[PDB]
Amino acid sequence: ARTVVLITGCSSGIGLHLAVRLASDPSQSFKVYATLRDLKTQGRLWEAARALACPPGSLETLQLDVRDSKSVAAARERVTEGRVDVLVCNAGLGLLGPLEALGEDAVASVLDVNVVGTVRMLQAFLPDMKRRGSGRVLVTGSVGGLMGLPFNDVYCASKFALEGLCESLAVLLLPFGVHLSLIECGPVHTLGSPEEVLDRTDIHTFHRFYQYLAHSKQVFREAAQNPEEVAEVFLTALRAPKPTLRYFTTERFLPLLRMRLDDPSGSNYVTAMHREVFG
Amino acid sequence: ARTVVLITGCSSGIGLHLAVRLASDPSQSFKVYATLRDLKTQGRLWEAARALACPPGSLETLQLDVRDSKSVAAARERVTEGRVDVLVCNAGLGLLGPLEALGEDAVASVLDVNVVGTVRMLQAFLPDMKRRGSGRVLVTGSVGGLMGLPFNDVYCASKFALEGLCESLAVLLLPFGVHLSLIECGPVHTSPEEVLDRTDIHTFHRFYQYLAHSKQVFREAAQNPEEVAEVFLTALRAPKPTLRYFTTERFLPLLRMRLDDPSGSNYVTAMHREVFG
């Protein structure tokens, strides 16, 4: 019988493309529960599943809101096979702006979804994998969790939080046979404001922001991968017999992660990334 | 022009010790606002300050609960000089255990106090430093924010979060004249029915292995809050301060081993045997 996969954040992007890539795999070894915050966004998913000709019963949708442990629980109970072989923690919010303009609730929500939500997922599904002696957990990580970037203060916070969360658990899970990996993504082919911003921020920050934005759209256009490409990395990690804690989707940033970790006082990275972003 | 300093989490430990040290400084160069979750708890602080004859008016206490933006803003406007030269984000909570055994609320508390709490402070105090073109922010970091350790999953997630938040602001903040630094601490001096039900027997084992191993590292490695406090003073008076300062070099090897292997497999192997016999 098949490898049972459950994936959070499947309405679009990586989650959507991974779920159908797995459910449509010519091996037909995967049963996929693609989970979604709101079942009303499932159109694109079911369209793509139908384009790739996913066999009947390879793909099912569940509603799963990672802010709500009872929603988490109810989705787990809906896994008829009664176990999960592969958990993919992929749901995540973005947030982009000068720290002082971001609404307090929005800061809270990014943490609650990206970090607390990933904790809830692991709390709900890890016990069974431990008791069993097997399971793959994959977490959609980020380059913004390895290095900080201006105006991504809270997004970066949350992705660094995943590093810490996962690295700690991975040290516990060795003699269990459960393999937690992070899939470190760079930019990908799939948040700001105006008078809201400037009122709260200051006249010089206001302009340093769009010098970041209009710079970012450059790096978008030279390394923003396909989610198919990314999905495919999640696959290599599943089929890995001894998977590592991190996998990288693109190499275009391993220069800086060399430079960053040369200086343990860290002010080399600060200087170099400031020049590289602005001038 | 005295240096105005505002510090969170001053009822005890690092925050208390830094507060009295700056207020007693022979120069009387510093005016200290030492803040507390609850003011009723300020007894020990003033006793410590009285011990070093901190002159009158060199130390003020305030209530500041970092979970509440109004507490943060009210505390800010009690700063009679109308500015802060040095902001110390030191308030923090701990949480230790197997992930599946920790309460959901406890998990959200740690993130809210440790991460969002620090974001609130920065939201309330940074803009003033930006328009003025000057200011220092010191944040109490941890080696647990540089490397993950078993049963410290949520604690580490929060200290890692601090690293990303601060490193991201630091890149924005060079040209404004505002220096942010993390003071990276190691350990610092100051039930199995309920465990077992919420966790397999396998993990119940490891947790107590870890607990015995932690005891030892604490006996060997722990620092006085006063030694830590002195590193904050170095950062304060560094003419161009760096993003991190370490209160110990003890764990820098383990940290480099982790920096050697970006795939992270080496770190985990090493720390697993190192921790579990």
XYZ file of C-alpha atoms in Angstrom:
556
model
C 0.000 0.000 0.000
C 0.857 3.651 -0.457
C 2.942 6.263 1.325
C 0.448 8.564 3.087
C 1.326 12.280 2.641
C -0.354 15.241 4.431
C 0.516 18.790 3.241
C -0.541 22.178 4.651
C -0.970 25.301 2.427
C -2.130 23.646 -0.846
C -4.365 26.326 -2.406
C -1.367 27.637 -4.396
C 2.347 27.616 -4.990
C 4.636 24.963 -3.516
C 1.878 23.165 -1.586
C -0.350 22.848 -4.698
C 2.422 21.770 -7.032
C 3.877 19.272 -4.538
C 0.542 17.607 -3.786
C -0.303 16.969 -7.483
C 3.345 16.044 -8.320
C 3.090 13.347 -5.658
C -0.452 12.203 -6.386
C 0.370 12.076 -10.139
C 3.677 10.293 -9.679
C 3.884 7.544 -12.328
C 4.877 5.072 -9.516
C 1.399 5.640 -8.003
C 2.893 5.075 -4.555
C 1.415 8.241 -2.898
C -1.867 8.973 -1.142
C -2.026 12.737 -0.681
C -4.132 14.717 1.766
C -3.797 18.282 0.448
C -4.966 20.537 3.232
C -6.205 24.113 2.936
C -7.202 26.983 5.207
C -10.452 27.458 3.262
C -11.894 24.688 1.070
C -13.353 27.392 -1.237
C -9.831 28.033 -2.679
C -9.472 24.450 -3.945
C -10.231 25.201 -7.659
C -6.681 25.577 -8.932
C -5.684 22.498 -6.997
C -8.372 20.311 -8.586
C -7.723 21.817 -12.023
C -3.994 20.902 -11.795
C -4.784 17.424 -10.405
C -6.980 16.856 -13.433
C -4.342 18.230 -15.880
C -1.709 15.821 -14.516
C -4.275 13.029 -14.525
C -4.013 12.059 -10.841
C -5.549 8.619 -10.339
C -8.863 8.414 -8.358
C -8.199 8.408 -4.616
C -4.517 9.589 -4.884
C -5.668 13.100 -3.783
C -8.140 14.328 -1.144
C -8.717 17.737 0.329
C -9.196 18.618 3.992
C -9.859 21.959 5.600
C -7.013 22.674 8.028
C -6.359 25.969 9.713
C -2.991 25.849 11.498
C -4.053 28.602 13.994
C -6.686 26.195 15.394
C -5.541 22.993 17.098
C -9.061 21.498 16.790
C -9.003 22.069 13.048
C -5.570 20.366 13.189
C -7.048 17.454 15.209
C -10.091 17.044 12.936
C -7.861 16.756 9.864
C -5.712 14.079 11.573
C -8.875 12.074 12.415
C -9.814 12.244 8.705
C -6.719 10.209 7.730
C -8.589 6.931 7.138
C -5.281 4.951 6.803
C -4.709 5.955 10.439
C -1.127 7.120 9.963
C 1.015 9.662 8.225
C 4.271 8.640 6.542
C 5.111 12.078 5.234
C 4.106 15.354 6.941
C 4.814 18.527 4.952
C 4.559 21.740 7.000
C 4.311 24.320 4.257
C 1.591 26.794 5.306
C 3.020 30.291 5.827
C 2.235 34.019 5.741
C 4.413 36.757 4.314
C 5.030 40.186 5.791
C 6.993 42.977 4.285
C 7.630 46.494 5.529
C 9.533 48.765 7.895
C 9.105 47.354 11.395
C 7.273 50.406 12.761
C 4.542 50.412 10.034
C 3.475 46.747 10.459
C 0.303 46.318 12.456
C 0.687 44.537 15.768
C -1.956 41.940 14.879
C -0.194 41.192 11.639
C 3.089 40.570 13.503
C 1.257 38.206 15.883
C -0.436 36.371 13.022
C 2.804 35.723 11.119
C 4.297 34.106 14.254
C 1.094 32.262 15.074
C 0.800 30.787 11.568
C 4.477 30.175 10.689
C 5.848 29.090 14.051
C 3.015 28.250 16.470
C 1.036 26.539 13.678
C 4.043 24.427 12.715
C 4.407 23.514 16.388
C 0.701 22.490 16.497
C 1.158 20.319 13.417
C 4.173 18.610 14.984
C 2.382 18.209 18.313
C -0.616 16.564 16.590
C 1.277 14.201 14.253
C 4.732 13.476 15.814
C 3.605 11.113 18.584
C 2.294 8.544 16.097
C 5.543 8.718 14.088
C 7.670 8.303 17.272
C 5.621 5.379 18.658
C 5.893 3.808 15.201
C 9.630 4.191 14.602
C 9.066 5.931 11.207
C 8.022 9.116 9.399
C 9.400 11.897 7.249
C 8.678 15.474 8.311
C 9.457 18.200 5.760
C 9.186 21.880 6.607
C 9.123 24.623 3.968
C 12.143 26.603 5.185
C 13.706 29.721 3.718
C 16.906 31.554 2.923
C 15.385 34.329 5.021
C 15.730 31.870 7.966
C 19.494 31.599 7.495
C 20.267 35.275 6.855
C 18.398 38.457 7.767
C 17.207 41.034 5.238
C 15.927 44.532 5.743
C 12.207 45.064 5.663
C 11.729 41.270 6.151
C 12.230 41.692 9.939
C 9.202 39.678 11.102
C 9.119 37.240 8.179
C 12.817 36.533 8.846
C 12.093 36.164 12.584
C 9.540 33.449 11.852
C 11.810 31.513 9.411
C 14.776 31.703 11.789
C 12.270 30.381 14.413
C 11.745 27.294 12.177
C 15.514 26.723 12.063
C 15.638 26.709 15.849
C 12.464 24.645 16.154
C 13.568 21.989 13.678
C 17.243 21.773 14.619
C 16.315 21.131 18.244
C 13.774 18.380 17.444
C 16.082 16.761 14.862
C 18.640 16.205 17.666
C 15.947 14.391 19.657
C 14.613 12.323 16.719
C 17.834 10.416 15.714
C 17.282 7.059 17.578
C 13.549 7.199 16.588
C 13.803 6.684 12.800
C 11.818 9.906 12.121
C 13.712 12.254 9.706
C 12.932 15.983 9.963
C 14.294 18.070 7.122
C 13.977 21.748 6.094
C 13.692 22.628 2.430
C 15.510 25.926 2.217
C 13.837 27.895 -0.547
C 15.070 31.078 -2.183
C 12.662 33.236 -4.181
C 9.778 31.500 -6.002
C 7.378 32.235 -8.916
C 4.024 32.976 -7.169
C 2.182 43.022 0.899
C 3.172 46.751 1.086
C 1.071 49.980 1.192
C 1.449 53.808 0.771
C -0.198 56.343 3.151
C -0.541 53.625 5.769
C 3.274 53.224 5.602
C 4.460 56.873 5.562
C 2.176 58.009 8.450
C 3.691 55.370 10.732
C 7.274 55.331 9.354
C 9.634 58.269 8.606
C 10.407 60.216 5.472
C 13.851 58.535 4.892
C 12.712 54.983 5.727
C 9.813 55.461 3.283
C 12.336 55.833 0.419
C 14.883 53.227 1.645
C 11.949 50.760 1.448
C 11.307 51.128 -2.342
C 15.089 51.077 -2.934
C 14.736 47.606 -1.344
C 11.526 46.740 -3.307
C 12.760 47.904 -6.700
C 16.053 46.057 -5.915
C 14.216 42.859 -4.901
C 12.271 42.636 -8.186
C 15.737 42.334 -9.789
C 16.647 39.209 -7.738
C 13.082 37.925 -8.432
C 13.964 38.030 -12.164
C 17.408 36.244 -11.908
C 16.638 33.361 -9.402
C 12.814 33.130 -8.736
C 12.490 29.349 -9.301
C 9.450 27.382 -10.527
C 7.521 25.606 -7.753
C 7.913 22.469 -9.933
C 11.653 22.810 -9.478
C 11.047 23.307 -5.734
C 8.540 20.481 -5.432
C 11.119 18.239 -6.983
C 13.561 19.027 -4.134
C 10.906 17.893 -1.567
C 10.840 14.568 -3.577
C 14.629 14.044 -3.394
C 14.287 14.487 0.422
C 11.495 11.859 0.617
C 13.439 9.317 -1.411
C 16.639 10.112 0.534
C 17.616 7.032 2.604
C 19.439 9.180 5.216
C 18.129 12.686 4.569
C 19.963 15.706 5.912
C 18.420 18.395 8.113
C 18.663 20.982 5.281
C 18.272 20.872 1.506
C 18.719 23.903 -0.741
C 16.508 24.654 -3.753
C 18.898 27.166 -5.451
C 22.653 27.785 -4.971
C 22.551 31.490 -5.871
C 22.845 32.426 -2.143
C 25.610 30.062 -0.832
C 28.128 32.874 -1.458
C 26.626 34.994 1.369
C 26.012 32.071 3.746
C 29.771 31.465 3.391
C 30.556 35.171 4.125
C 27.988 35.490 6.949
C 29.409 32.574 8.936
C 33.054 33.695 8.446
C 32.403 36.529 10.948
C 30.915 35.266 14.280
C 30.561 38.914 15.519
C 28.365 39.176 12.428
C 29.130 42.737 11.330
C 30.779 41.571 8.050
C 27.357 40.368 6.823
C 25.633 43.541 7.991
C 28.119 45.720 6.019
C 28.171 43.580 2.883
C 24.401 43.011 2.669
C 23.822 46.734 3.248
C 26.052 47.617 0.268
C 24.566 44.852 -1.883
C 20.908 46.008 -1.237
C 21.296 49.794 -1.484
C 24.692 51.115 -2.745
C 23.826 65.282 28.810
C 23.557 62.032 30.772
C 23.068 58.807 28.811
C 19.395 57.776 29.155
C 19.014 53.987 29.455
C 15.803 51.976 29.528
C 15.933 48.255 30.326
C 13.158 45.669 30.326
C 12.943 42.739 32.842
C 14.642 44.394 35.797
C 13.038 42.597 38.835
C 15.976 40.156 38.907
C 19.017 38.706 37.113
C 20.749 40.295 34.139
C 18.380 43.260 33.983
C 18.657 44.083 37.667
C 22.413 43.699 37.621
C 22.865 45.926 34.521
C 20.525 48.533 35.985
C 22.422 49.067 39.262
C 25.809 48.888 37.550
C 24.942 51.737 35.186
C 23.236 53.816 37.937
C 26.306 53.395 40.279
C 28.866 54.237 37.557
C 31.491 56.652 39.122
C 30.964 59.212 36.327
C 27.180 59.390 36.877
C 27.138 59.355 33.056
C 23.910 57.234 33.013
C 20.278 57.855 33.900
C 18.564 54.473 34.206
C 14.894 53.508 33.682
C 14.665 49.999 34.927
C 11.308 48.501 33.970
C 9.290 45.601 35.337
C 6.335 43.398 34.405
C 4.929 44.284 37.898
C 6.198 47.197 40.096
C 5.340 45.387 43.379
C 8.327 43.149 42.593
C 10.841 46.098 42.699
C 12.101 45.451 46.284
C 15.242 43.507 45.382
C 16.213 46.027 42.674
C 16.197 49.001 45.072
C 17.987 46.966 47.758
C 20.735 46.229 45.232
C 20.817 49.893 44.183
C 20.930 51.029 47.816
C 23.876 48.632 48.363
C 25.947 50.627 45.783
C 24.651 54.089 46.904
C 23.255 54.796 43.470
C 22.741 58.546 43.757
C 19.139 59.898 43.806
C 17.733 60.459 40.288
C 20.162 58.057 38.574
C 17.563 55.225 38.726
C 13.751 55.357 38.080
C 11.527 52.255 38.010
C 8.460 51.758 35.810
C 5.891 49.153 34.963
C 6.269 47.880 31.410
C 4.626 44.647 30.340
C 6.011 43.745 26.886
C 2.839 41.798 26.002
C 0.847 45.093 25.872
C 1.583 47.950 23.469
C -0.159 50.497 25.801
C 2.047 49.520 28.696
C 5.009 50.011 26.327
C 3.778 53.470 25.139
C 2.863 54.661 28.675
C 6.305 53.605 29.902
C 7.857 55.522 26.973
C 6.101 58.811 27.793
C 7.160 58.587 31.483
C 10.755 59.150 30.135
C 10.972 62.725 31.218
C 14.022 63.568 29.051
C 12.015 62.832 25.940
C 14.583 60.358 24.538
C 16.437 57.064 25.045
C 20.149 56.767 24.116
C 20.331 53.068 25.088
C 17.471 50.572 24.874
C 17.973 47.119 26.436
C 15.447 44.460 25.408
C 16.024 41.904 28.046
C 12.554 40.589 29.071
C 12.310 36.852 28.311
C 10.600 33.591 29.256
C 11.907 30.048 29.218
C 10.205 26.789 28.360
C 11.747 23.346 28.638
C 10.326 19.998 27.682
C 9.286 17.514 25.028
C 7.429 19.464 22.344
C 4.251 17.408 22.511
C 4.112 17.892 26.332
C 4.077 21.728 26.271
C 0.753 23.569 26.516
C -0.433 25.532 23.441
C -0.819 28.732 25.515
C 2.641 28.333 26.999
C 4.021 28.077 23.479
C 2.244 31.258 22.322
C 3.345 33.074 25.542
C 7.023 32.384 24.857
C 6.776 33.736 21.273
C 4.633 36.712 22.432
C 6.949 37.751 25.235
C 10.302 36.873 23.616
C 9.689 37.875 19.986
C 6.593 40.057 19.665
C 7.504 41.761 22.954
C 10.848 42.792 21.478
C 9.092 43.916 18.252
C 6.828 46.181 20.370
C 9.770 47.767 22.126
C 11.487 48.400 18.793
C 8.262 49.748 17.262
C 7.810 52.216 20.173
C 11.486 53.396 20.530
C 13.202 53.068 17.143
C 11.459 55.932 15.302
C 12.765 58.496 17.835
C 16.279 57.143 17.448
C 15.898 57.324 13.664
C 14.859 61.030 13.425
C 17.520 61.982 15.975
C 20.239 59.986 14.091
C 21.670 58.307 17.236
C 20.972 55.450 19.650
C 21.927 52.031 20.908
C 19.774 48.927 21.139
C 21.065 45.895 23.066
C 19.167 42.667 22.999
C 19.674 39.717 25.295
C 20.407 36.810 23.027
C 21.361 33.250 23.734
C 23.611 30.511 22.360
C 20.217 28.684 22.134
C 19.473 31.165 19.307
C 22.604 30.076 17.441
C 22.150 26.323 17.780
C 19.118 24.129 18.446
C 19.132 21.924 21.535
C 16.834 19.048 22.357
C 13.804 19.791 24.550
C 14.487 23.551 24.043
C 12.555 23.599 20.718
C 10.283 26.537 21.528
C 12.861 28.454 23.618
C 15.310 28.080 20.721
C 12.706 28.970 18.116
C 12.214 32.288 20.012
C 15.957 33.099 20.371
C 16.568 32.175 16.765
C 13.704 34.561 15.950
C 15.567 37.334 17.763
C 18.636 36.741 15.587
C 16.673 37.141 12.340
C 14.694 40.181 13.546
C 17.799 41.961 14.799
C 20.060 41.035 11.829
C 17.324 42.301 9.464
C 17.000 45.638 11.319
C 20.764 46.017 11.601
C 21.082 46.124 7.787
C 18.434 48.875 7.586
C 19.916 50.787 10.551
C 23.635 51.455 9.660
C 22.894 54.671 7.729
C 20.471 55.965 10.393
C 23.189 55.998 13.093
C 21.367 53.396 15.247
C 23.461 50.453 16.399
C 21.753 47.216 17.382
C 23.671 44.462 19.156
C 22.831 41.010 20.531
C 24.465 39.967 23.800
C 24.660 36.223 23.391
C 24.456 34.442 26.777
C 25.037 30.823 27.745
C 23.570 29.434 30.987
C 23.233 31.922 33.883
C 22.825 31.426 37.666
C 19.671 32.321 39.586
C 6.327 16.315 36.777
C 6.871 12.705 35.525
C 3.242 11.518 35.858
C 2.159 14.475 33.706
C 5.149 14.001 31.387
C 4.536 10.305 30.837
C 0.860 10.513 29.861
C 1.641 13.138 27.129
C 4.631 11.268 25.699
C 5.800 7.789 24.694
C 8.140 5.970 27.107
C 11.038 6.235 24.591
C 11.040 10.088 24.866
C 10.352 9.995 28.650
C 13.744 8.301 28.795
C 15.664 10.877 26.705
C 14.148 13.791 28.607
C 15.670 12.612 31.885
C 18.996 11.819 30.194
C 18.947 15.426 28.898
C 17.915 16.742 32.378
C 20.873 15.072 34.135
C 23.260 16.268 31.373
C 21.932 19.849 31.669
C 22.621 19.942 35.438
C 26.303 19.181 34.764
C 26.732 21.833 32.036
C 25.100 24.382 34.380
C 27.484 23.551 37.303
C 30.462 23.895 34.950
C 29.420 26.711 32.578
C 27.024 29.141 34.283
C 27.955 32.822 34.700
C 26.944 35.385 37.348
C 24.346 37.807 36.008
C 27.014 40.440 36.948
C 29.605 38.980 34.490
C 26.932 39.096 31.727
C 25.987 42.618 32.710
C 29.608 43.662 32.126
C 29.438 42.499 28.471
C 26.441 44.836 27.959
C 28.701 47.605 29.292
C 31.367 46.712 26.696
C 28.742 46.951 23.926
C 27.393 50.227 25.347
C 30.819 51.858 25.252
C 32.141 50.210 22.058
C 32.653 53.164 19.656
C 31.439 51.149 16.656
C 29.583 48.141 18.154
C 29.269 44.733 16.433
C 26.050 42.782 15.814
C 26.927 40.120 18.422
C 28.906 39.893 21.665
C 29.528 36.579 23.415
C 29.611 36.322 27.202
C 31.624 33.097 26.880
C 33.773 31.506 24.214
C 33.058 28.041 25.616
C 30.460 27.060 22.965
C 32.185 28.694 19.939
C 33.664 25.297 18.852
C 30.264 23.553 18.772
C 29.006 26.650 16.940
C 31.800 26.463 14.289
C 31.155 22.683 13.784
C 27.573 23.736 12.981
C 28.791 26.520 10.649
C 31.007 23.890 8.840
C 28.069 21.776 7.645
C 25.215 23.903 6.148
C 23.290 20.619 5.522
C 23.354 20.394 9.359
C 23.864 16.620 9.595
C 27.147 16.988 11.499
C 25.714 19.313 14.103
C 22.893 16.859 14.941
C 25.072 13.721 15.131
C 27.559 15.490 17.406
C 25.022 17.128 19.691
C 23.042 13.868 19.961
C 25.886 11.773 21.443
C 27.265 14.777 23.301
C 23.881 15.253 25.022
C 22.798 11.575 25.395
C 25.975 9.844 26.743
